[model samples]
Target: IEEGKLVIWINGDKGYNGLAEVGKKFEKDTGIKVTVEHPDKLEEKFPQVAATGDGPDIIFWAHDRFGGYAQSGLLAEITPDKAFQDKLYPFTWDAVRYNGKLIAYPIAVEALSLIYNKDLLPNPPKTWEEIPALDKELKAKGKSALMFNLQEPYFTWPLIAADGGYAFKYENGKYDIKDVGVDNAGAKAGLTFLVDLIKNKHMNADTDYSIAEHAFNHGETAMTINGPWAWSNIDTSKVNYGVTVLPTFKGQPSKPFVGVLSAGINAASPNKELAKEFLENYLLTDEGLEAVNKDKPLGAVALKSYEEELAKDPRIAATMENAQKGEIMPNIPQMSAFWYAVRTAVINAASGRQTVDAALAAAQTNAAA
Candidate 1:
């Protein structure tokens, strides 16, 4: 047990380097050493190392993985007091909790939103119904209205979920893996909308992540469905772009999957109290967040009070607003099945191998199995 030092393992160069700066400040303020490490393949390595009682005191990752870690007794429960809890967005709390227990402290939140070329779409469409007309208008000019990774459930979730489709039935702070809803009427309707777009040539059927990104970056498309992570890349292209909440479908607002990035204390750590102090006192503080944001520009901060500050950046503001309208992505291990089934269904439908109905029905069957 390291008596006077705490260790944190995080992935991503920007995040690791940004948090390392905070660790320096934390050590200066409290005479305790803080080491932040960036490790390769952290998602796979963390679980293996943690189970052997040889992991860092803290692990920084997305909230979706916390459920499995909590279920496996790899994470310590984080019970924030009401006052502390009030500081962040409520949905973030929900994202970090599993089985009604808070498993981590959320740092930032992100969700898919509409990113449009300002010159091409001075006023973006407010509803999906408006897109067809816009597509026709753009097509006449040798451009497309919108582009996105056609087969990725993460990117297409807003369309599907707008009509009440869901990966799993979440109730009372738990997910019912048995109740898969991807084949529901709403899900089929949403998917059919995408198929129709491809059929009508409003979007390219061959669009994948790289193709969609390239098209949007090169001004071949006026809008793209993506999260904040796309901003840095889009900025380099110098495309006059603006971010906004996704267009509504059938008068219902699109609901993208909200993802929260969080920090969890290891159950095997000897410095649990110190780790908690570092998180609450150093990391979650306004100054702390500001420091980290300066280094990496967080897409959307989790703290409700900090939103006003973040809103100054229109891109961050739009992402934060969209996140408010979304439901947290499921964190259970069953999500593996959800991803596989949805990907297969989307590919089959988009490739004309099966109708949307047939693809989704097969997804439900496969997920249930």
Candidate 2:
């Protein structure tokens, strides 16, 4: 930035913003000109451009993708200060690190929660056992008890994790991909619950992102499982909704996978020191954090004090509660393989194309491949 220009890359399509306000504040405080770039495909385009000496000074994205970028040697190692570590939740570091080295600064965190219509369903289900009665009552009112993206495994991961099913095992303080538990007894039990819901007509296999959120917004459904991003689709006044952490299964709490969006410096950038200063000094402050959330209220900011400020809002409090009850999503490059198998298994069980055991076994086979 001493040379007068600091370039940053962002993808607004993923609910993050271009930092219009932050840029103005930065340029005024320091004489450096901040240039923002909105790329069409940040994950695909970043490394390609960086190899040719055309990458931006900083890249803002989810922590899950950081592992692949770090493996490709595209991210700068961030040595956090006491203030830096103290600002965010402890789990935030779990996602931003690769092989014990911090590679990104967490901005916002996200997790799935139970969103209910306060008008229709006055009492939310405390456990999966209560859902059937709620479904029956809502059906009389021409509404379903609950709905979610049946085809996507991300939203349904809580059910699996509740019973000890997991994508990878933690062995000797490291995530061991070789010991996948997605095909175990716990997975079968979890998938069976979902299958029973479909077979009993309590939920439908056709429910998707648009339909699930649309039904909740338009008063066609009483409850749904979703994240903060789904808030945009809702009409708050008409729906009269409340959010909570996901309900337990038979005896266990449903722990959804949590993800964090963060800011990372490009390893190949010319202005590395300037980028670090911009993130630590300007962007992570209360004002800059507010500006980031102003564009899109995705959840709580990683900063503890700022996060407490955000928790004053009931909706954000619910989001933070869900994140607390959830498990941290793995930031390894192997996650790409993990998602495909999990999706196929969950979708297959929900669609009734295969039994729960068969689908789970198939998922383990595919993941191992």
Candidate 3:
């Protein structure tokens, strides 16, 4: 209850600190006591505590992993938080919406784009067809072309949705998850393009992603695709870097599975009103939006309280521009199977574990079933 007390469980250190700021503000302003719980042995304790049906008043976990929890009725449903719903971005609001209802509140959203060494490359290829030829041009000049390191977890997913390559299709203004567009002619062409690069050893998944960024900074490679976070690490003195949304194969511009972290109230909480009130107040505050910007500086989903600060901050403005074109990561019970199945179709085909036709067949079958 808002008048009583509340408990919050967070997993990662970065996440903990972010919430701590929110918690401190809540307590100071409302006199609602809060216990911020960060368990080191979260993997072991999460399921045990969550399963006991005595979990904290509020919980924040990975959006994907929590998909099953929300489906299984372990987590609280937040669709009833109408006041909170109206303040957030559409794509961001969609991220937490499952089966026609909202399940969580997002705190941040990420969009992937071609973040290239602007000085060396000058201009990034707007389409997939131009990437290789430009790379060859760079190679002839004795500079490396581009880096596509898969070993590094932070690598971007441009090729998967480039021109002639797309994962899910948004037809008729809605997501058609069963449309495994990778098997389409354009998609196959895109896949073949990447396969050719792999065969030629021009791009190696084994190399670390950072190496590519380093190459760009040192003018070794001309460009690579990455998220907004990488903007901070680029050696701006050596190379000029620019960002652009992932391109389309024909008329379709492929987009990453954009993710948003939001704040949702506990439906089961005796202090439901209080919790929602807290989220509403905090989300609009100068401090709350600034805290999010300070920590991540990614695309702002909502009109931030301090829009002037954002205009003055080049990086924040760049991210905000990207957010205008971003897509929402699905928030559905079936999203778990949907994402992996898409990955399995394309990733398996790329890895030769399954042919594109077979992978698409299996993927579509699963989606239909």
Candidate 4:
């Protein structure tokens, strides 16, 4: 057992660097060395290593993996006291829980929204129905109304779920994997909305992320459905853009998937108590959060107090508002089936290869298998 030292595995340089700064302070305060490793294929490697009792003390990653990890006995149950819980946004807690137990400590949260070019469209549309008129106005100027990764389920789920669509039925703190809703009436309505946009030439049927990004960056598209990670590219291209909540669908709010970044203690680690102490006393503190945030501005902080400060940035405010209206992405491992099936359905419906109803029905069959 490695005594007086804590190890953490994180995937990206931005998160690693941020935590490295926090590590230095944690070491100074607690006299316990904190080592943050930037590893490749972290998600793939973590489970294998964790099962052998040879993994790092903590795994830093998104909350989407919490269910799979916890179910596999790879994560320790974290019981953050009520005071600590009160400091965080309540929605975030849902993202990191499994079977009524806390599985991770949420760090930041993000969600998709309408990112529009201010120069092209001074007024962003508030509802999906208004897009056709906006498309006509933009077409005269040789620009499309909006674009996004058409086949990407994550980007398209907001539209898919706007009416009443859902991947799985979530209730009383668990997902009913058997009840797939991709073919439901509401899902058909939302998919039909997309098909109509394609048929009217308001959006290209084949548009993917790269095409949409290039089009938006070059001012060929007036708006795009994207999250905070897309801002750097737009900023690099010098596009004057504004962020806002997505347009309503049939007068109902669009609900995108809310994603959370979190830290989970390894169930196999010898330093569980120390790891919890570092997370509770060091990383959760204002100074620690600030240090990490300085390196890479977290899209939105999990702590309610910290988010209040970060929300000063209009983009963060818009994202927080959108996330407030959105549902936490299902963290269950069964989401793999949901992603694959929905992506196929989106492609089939968008390409006119299958009617929206047929595509969704097929998706439901495949996902429910």
Top TM-score model: 2
Residue-wise lDDT of candidate 1 within 83-150, one digit each (tens)? 88889888788888788889999988877889999999899999998899999999899998999998
Candidate 2, residues 1-369: lDDT per residue as tens digits?
124478888765334452756876888988777887778768668878866666888998767778878887888898778877887888787779888799999987888889998888788988887898889988987889998888778888889878878888877878887888898988788889988989999998888877887788888888999876666556443678888868898788898888797888888777777787888878888888777666656587788888887778888887877777767788887776788899988888888888889989989877764
Using lDDT, give the best candidate's number: 4
Of 3 and 4, the candidate ahead on lDDT is 4
lDDT of 1: 0.84
Candidates in order have lDDT scores of 0.84, 0.80, 0.58, 0.86
Residues 1-369 of candidate 4 have per-residue lDDT tens digits of 376689988765344676887898889888889998978768778988988877889888778877888998999998788998999988888889888899999988878889999999899999999999999998998888998989678888888898999988989966788998899888899889999999988887899888998999999999999877677667779999999999999988898988898899999888888999989888877877887776655679888888887778999889878888778788897776787889899998999999999999999999896
Q: Write the per-residue lDDT of candidate 3 for residues 257-318, one digit (tens) a residue.
A: 56565544444466655655555677445677666445435454453345444556555454
Write the candidate numbers in order of decreasing lDDT: 4, 1, 2, 3
Query: How close is every model to the real structure, measured as TM-score?
Result: 0.81, 0.84, 0.71, 0.81
List where candidate 2 sits over 4 angstroms from the true fold.
1-18, 27-57, 79-86, 232-238, 271-274
For candidate 3, the lDDT comes to 0.58
